[PDB]
Homo-oligomer: A and B are copies of this chain.
């Protein structure tokens, strides 16, 4: 029996560890039981966002000191997934996952379970291609076993951090005689997100393997996962996976549920995800621990038939706009802008939409 506790912690800057330290110093968190930290950091969330790496370095430094181990050991032990971009009213914060073994009686209900797995590092020419899909799928299965979830229907959110391309890395690949999937560094984020998402879909049985090929990645939007949430960053060269679902072997006082936003203003889907996590009315919103969602600009350039400029705006990249919009929609339903919204939902929900999960107290 394992019990998962989840702490959503406001942050003052990317390197702010004070909220986590307060929970450790008060005895609410044993640092040795932390298994994953999922952050919203306030950089631009795109290629040249160094707040993600700054936040991970700061958390790993702090935990290494608290645990008496090296930073390298902390990064091998704990998943650090930092999603940049806190546009609009979205509030920077970290969500800390704590897992402990407990001797507790079995109960009929399934309760929150979390699992973690890491892939090998990828060469730049593997991003957005079948090697990334297949390695991610293996890691997702590994993380499910870590979460003691055997039925993929009980997986409600699979959070992934994945790499991207920079000009220097594209040049390194070229020197080795290799072509990368795309030469635009911003677009490279989409291919890494999309290949990683398809790996989730493959692992969970949402899509059969014979449908996935290099040619389909970031092209066939009818191929998608309903629970994958992927996020790209300059600060890592592999994929990190957090599987979140419900398990019969869990003693948690939390559950997770989810829905899929059909488009960026689909407040009905927010309410559906809340209801799936056991929150039946506005009066029960106080049981939210966090809301986690993917947002994107639709390839059509429209929302319910209405044109917008997200794909056209050379001044502001579209994943920034999408995060602002979907965080605002969620905030207006739950009354709190301190929720997790990540942009770029290639093969995550339909084109223009994305998965949305809610972790709630029972």
Whether a CB of chain B sits under 8 angstroms from the CB of A46 is: yes
Whether a CB of chain B sits under 8 angstroms from the CB of A51 is: yes
Whether a CB of chain B sits under 8 angstroms from the CB of A31 is: no
> Quick one: closest B residue to A282, CB to CB?
B268
With contacts A185-B311, A328-B329 taken as known, whether A89 is within 8 angstroms of B167 at the C-beta atoms is: no
CA A185 – CA B12 in complex, angstroms? 16
Among the listed B184, B185, B307, which residue makes an inter-chain contact with A92, where contact means beta carbons less than 8 Å apart?
Answer: B307
Number of chain copies forming the complex: 4
CB of A46 within 8 A of CB of B317, answer: no
CB of B309 within 8 A of CB of A92, answer: yes
With contacts A171-B300, A314-B186 taken as known, whether A91 is within 8 angstroms of B265 at the C-beta atoms is: no
CB of B324 within 8 A of CB of A42, answer: no
Inside 8 A of A168's CB, which chain B residues have their CB?
A: 12, 301, 307
Interface hit among A108-116, A144-152, A335-343: A335-343
CB distance from A164 to the nearest CB of B (A): 10
With contacts A310-B88, A317-B314, A337-B303 taken as known, whether A50 is within 8 angstroms of B51 at the C-beta atoms is: yes
Q: Which of A92, A320, A325 has the most CB of B within 10 A?
A: A325
Whether a CB of chain B sits under 8 angstroms from the CB of A267 is: yes
CB of A301 within 8 A of CB of B88, answer: no
CB of A325 within 8 A of CB of B89, answer: yes
CB distance from A301 to the nearest CB of B (A): 3
Among the listed B15, B306, B336, which residue makes an inter-chain contact with A338, where contact means beta carbons less than 8 Å apart?
Answer: B306
Inside 8 A of A44's CB, which chain B residues have their CB?
A: 314-315
Inside 8 A of A171's CB, which chain B residues have their CB?
A: 299-302
- Taken residue by residue from 40 to 54, chain A's Cβ proximity to chain B (1 for < 8 Å, 0 otherwise) reads as 001110111111011
CB of B167 within 8 A of CB of A301, answer: yes
CA A324 – CA B300 in complex, angstroms? 19
Among the listed B51, B324, B329, which residue makes an inter-chain contact with A321, where contact means beta carbons less than 8 Å apart?
Answer: B324
Among the listed B49, B53, B266, B315, which residue makes an inter-chain contact with A15, where contact means beta carbons less than 8 Å apart?
Answer: B53
